[model samples]
Target chain A: AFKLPNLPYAYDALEPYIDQRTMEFHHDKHHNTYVTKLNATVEGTELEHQSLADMIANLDKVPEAMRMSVRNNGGGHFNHSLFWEILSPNSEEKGGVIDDIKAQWGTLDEFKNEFANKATTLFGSGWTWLVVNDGKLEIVTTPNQDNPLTEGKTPILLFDVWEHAYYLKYQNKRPDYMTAFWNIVNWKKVDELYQAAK
Target chain B: AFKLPNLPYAYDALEPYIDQRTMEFHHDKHHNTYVTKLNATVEGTELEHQSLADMIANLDKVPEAMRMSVRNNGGGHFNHSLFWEILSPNSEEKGGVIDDIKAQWGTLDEFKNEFANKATTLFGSGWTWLVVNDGKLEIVTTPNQDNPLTEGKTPILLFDVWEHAYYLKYQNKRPDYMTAFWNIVNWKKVDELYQAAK
Candidate 1:
């Protein structure tokens, strides 16, 4: 059965940028419900044995009636797991992924500008990802608990643009939340994932 | 160019149930942006002269580059227009629409139970609608500013489940918001729309 992972830091660790109340609601209610639903959908089925990532990537393996539930819940579980990990109040060990981003988009600010544009204009509930697609860094957005892994991309970092993620603090100003997200990014963990993906 | 319409009543009209702050943000910020973008998307083009409902229904008329923009913004305009009209602090002249609803679902509570289920389980940003298809009442859901008009159905009533709508007071408790929605619904306007659709 799937389990909800704990946030690496206290709910208030990213305070002033991402608030404590938003984090608490997001993880405890939104993220935990996804884990609970995923377990409920897969319990007593062969799907219980498959890795969450594999199950999400190959959804045809899920029974037809259960496919949508598994896709949404399983993707929510996998995405939230990565989201919690790639956020920290204190990030360390900045690495070659910096050079890779620079090589792709010329500078960090330009990359951020492009990413923020996608995040703001995303139109609905979704996530924006910085992913490795065929060894090349790319930015992509997916709707509603969908993840880059489903498209065979290796996600190094992501921002949950779902309203529940920021509505408490940012309201309709998603760009504000996007701007503040940079302050808490766990670059060390992102770099580790980048290295492992390669 | 498209214009943002005023709320049919004061922002605080649905207070305690919907809240004043959320209504202001939803209409002034989120809904207005869709109007502004729709105007920007269609200005100086033939599409500018088309009705918002008709344009949304026949999106193939839009240019490839602009189709998505029109679909999102046009649907946002049409959907919100209906949303504002169907809500009232004092709904009057309750009529045959109640009988129609009972005919479809056996009881008002049963109908509301099904509608509430769709609203809660919608999985992402969207709306749950009471629409007329083939001149009969039905409940349906659409994701991200989509409307029943686009699918050849006539929407009589809808609940905007976007987090921006209720996130201020309700936060993660969408079910509570759905329950509160019943108190403010304008059954007179629903009957008017239902009559016109037939």
Candidate 2:
């Protein structure tokens, strides 16, 4: 069974930008539900023991009956796991990937704008990603639960555009949510992912 | 420049479900901005006087430089206009087209579940709709500026799933926002639209 990862900061830490009630429901209920359902779907299946990445990598092998569940829950599990790992209380002070961002996108603000626009413009339930594709940093949007790792790209930073990510805090104001996400980004974790991809 | 539409009810009428601050930003800033930009993009151009529907209908004919602006702002205007029309303060007495929903989906709860699922499951920046297509009521999802109208379906009702829709109130708890939407649905406005459509 997938377990809920403890948040690095208190639930209310991102308040004003993200409310405590929203954080509680999003983490405790929504993310937890995904993990629970994902575990239930995998029980007794050949894929039960596989790592989350492995299941995502072999999506075609997932039984048809469980395809949607796995996509939704599995994607939820993987995305939330990465999301938590990459958020930090000291985003401004710990600038691990600042140099890489400047080198690639020419400046951090340009990169943020590009990422925000991509996240804002996704057509439906999916994610906006900053990934290392073919050893070059690129921005891409993926539909549904599909992620960069599934397509052989190395994800450095991911922003979930799924409404569940920001509905309570921003409501129909996705741009605002995207703007605030920058304030809490975990640059250290992103740097590790970026370097590992190389 | 585009002007904000007057709310059918006072801003606080939907209180406890939707906040006044959210409505102000959503209506004044977000929706108005889309309209202003849409007008700016069409000004002095071959498409200047075309109605919003006509512009979207002939999207392919738009100049390449203006296509994205038209698609984004025009769709935003259409979506928000419809969104406002389908909400009301007196849902108890003014429910819209519940009979059509019953005839098509068997029961109101079933329709709610179906619509809710579509809204929750949509993959990214898009909309979930209850539409009339070829004389049949249908549930559909569209990505980005791609609305059901563009695909030949007559939209009967729509729910915007973009993060901006409920982020301030629900914050990543989109399902909760979806649940609350039912409480404010303007059945009277829906009935009027349905009558006009036929």
Candidate 3:
């Protein structure tokens, strides 16, 4: 079985913004279930030997009954892996992405409102992205298990708006959860990813 | 063992409306999972021999490990079985006339407006229902695959507001989506159900 990734921050680190229980479930139960399901679906299949990237890029070729398992779990694994890396509790220093963000979108609240709208307006289960397009940042959303990569875009940051992502803590107030997302985002890391993608 | 109900209307019958894709997933994947999981959870248990109505109505006897599985999925199996019969594409031929609805709420449109309000304002994943109260009809809603029957109420009609229900066709436009639901209803069937409940 593939091992679950370690959370970059302590479970309680994002408390008040993203609670400890939510962090545990999002990382341990839900994300780990995806890992287990992914491993089980790919076992003994030709896709078992395929690279994770290759399997995802050509998920249509998977066995019909097992295709959704692979798509959802595989995307779960892919997205969560990135999620952990780009979030940190240390917000005293919001970092370099601030300059570019202010240049394009004015106040950080304006940027937050823009991104939050993208996150809240997304239908059902999905992710909203702050991706770099030709060195300019743009907001995009993708349905269950889909990511900006699938659309050939370079994502620097993303917020999961799936029900499971914030349901336990935020209930039906997805907009509240979107407001809280900014509290724990690692914009320094985002700036790093943005320059690298550029 | 409980089985998935055959959809009473054609998949595309509620088209440009419910759409074939959403209906297929809601039935084939969502409803079927409820059936399969409920059966598995009850296999060889005392509850296995118990009727779904009994097990669901009195859930304390259920094994806690499988209690929620039975409640949500079993409720899923029960709720969806009825949901299909009460909806239709032929507005002109909405089977079974509904009179008590007009009696209680003034006009059929007024009743629909009230029911849709309950459906749209529902906080999260759940269902909205119109039920026979102590000799009259009332609108109610429950969270997570629950129906009005659980509360000693007789359900005459229901609308699934779960993200899965309208996420495909309605997205974040749940109100608009609910408005469109008026186009495909089996009022004749609703009247028949109301009559039987009485």
Of the candidates shown, which would achieve the greatest TM-score relative to the real structure? 1
lDDT of 3 by residue, B8-34 (tens): 878988888787887887798778877
lDDT of 1 by residue, B52-129 (tens): 888787887778999898889888888887889899999653688998888878889999999999999998989999
Docking model 3 quality class? incorrect
For every model shown, what is its TM-score relative to the native structure?
0.97, 0.81, 0.53
Native contact fraction per model: 0.88, 0.67, 0.00
Give the top-scoring candidate (DockQ).
1
Chain B vs. true chain B: TM-score for each candidate? 0.97, 0.93, 0.92
What residue runs in model 1 are displaced by over 4 Å at the alpha carbon? none
What is the lDDT of every predicted structure here? Answer: 0.89, 0.79, 0.77
Best by lDDT: 1
**Candidate 3 chain B least-lDDT 10 residues:** B92-101
Descending-TM-score candidate ranking: 1, 2, 3
Docking class of 1: high
Worst 10 residues of 1 chain A by lDDT: A91-100
lDDT of 2 by residue, A34-98 (tens): 78988889978887878888778678888999977787789888888888777676676245467
Candidate 1: residue B163 lDDT (0-100): 92
Model 2, B1-198: lDDT tens digits are 445577788878888678787787778877887888888888786677778777777788778999888888889898898898888777753334677678778888998999999999775567888888776778999876577776767887888877666767665667898888888888878777777776
Give candidates' CA RMSD values in order. Answer: 1.4, 3.8, 20.2
